[PDB]
Amino acid sequence: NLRSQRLNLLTNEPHQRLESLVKSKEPFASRDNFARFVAAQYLFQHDLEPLYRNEALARLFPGLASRARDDAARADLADLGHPVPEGDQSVREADLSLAEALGWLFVSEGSKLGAAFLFKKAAALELDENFGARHLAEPEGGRAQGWKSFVAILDGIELNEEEERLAAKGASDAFNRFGDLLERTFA
């Protein structure tokens, strides 16, 4: 019924595939490997920037701007001595509909879930919230409620059937994009 639940079903496979891809790149084998993972996160933030700063979406999601993680990820790349990668502008210039944008935000916000596990694994590489893993630090209100607050708004929006299709497309496209970014930074 809820939009969030439908999106969860629709992206269950892409998620399993993505989780497997991440495990295969061995992000915690070394700081260099971890840095390549941070580079992928950083590039995904560049794709999402125009959405987190969009006035229309900011009105729908109060506090939107502060959900971005670009400064932290860029600071982490600097800590790790990894040069910042160049964004290809493909998503920023894609001219996404509002509905597609909701699917991209769904995936970006959802990608924060379980980050405490990644944060814990980063400790093995002697990294933490003040060095190298700044982008995985837990948010103020806590990961849980941050997600619950976002989903309540998402599920309340009224969309027509075409817009629902576009939101699903946006979520699918975002999962595929993160995978492309990982293949790029680990190449």
Interface with ligand HEM by CB under 6 A: which residues?
8, 11, 15, 18-19, 22, 106-107, 110-111, 113-114, 117-118, 175, 178
CB of 26 to ligand HEM, least distance (A): 12
148 is in an annotated binding site: no
Q: Which is nearer to ligand HEM, 61 or 106 (CB)?
A: 106
25 is in an annotated binding site: no
Q: Determine the residue with CB nearest ligand HEM.
A: 110
CB of 112 to ligand HEM, least distance (A): 8
CB of 114 to ligand HEM, least distance (A): 3
Task: State the greatest distance between any 2 C-alpha atoms of the chain, in Å, as a whole number.
Answer: 49
Q: Which is nearer to ligand HEM, 117 or 131 (CB)?
A: 117
DSSP secondary structure letters along 112-126 = TTTHHHHHHHHGGGT
Nearest-angstrom CA–CA distance, 57 and 138: 23
CA distances from 112 to 71, 116, 119, 137 (A): 16, 9, 11, 10
Nearest-angstrom CA–CA distance, 124 and 25: 17
Nearest-angstrom CA–CA distance, 84 and 73: 10
Nearest-angstrom CA–CA distance, 52 and 54: 6
Residue among 95, 104, 92, 102 at smallest CA distance from 46: 92
- Count the residues in the chain: 187
Q: Which is nearer to ligand HEM, 81 or 168 (CB)?
A: 168
Q: Which is nearer to ligand HEM, 81 or 187 (CB)?
A: 187
Q: Which is nearer to ligand HEM, 134 or 170 (CB)?
A: 170
CB of 28 to ligand HEM, least distance (A): 9
Nearest-angstrom CA–CA distance, 55 and 31: 37
CB of 8 to ligand HEM, least distance (A): 6
Q: Binding site: what residues are annotated?
A: 15, 121
Q: Binding site for heme b: what residues are annotated?
A: 15, 121
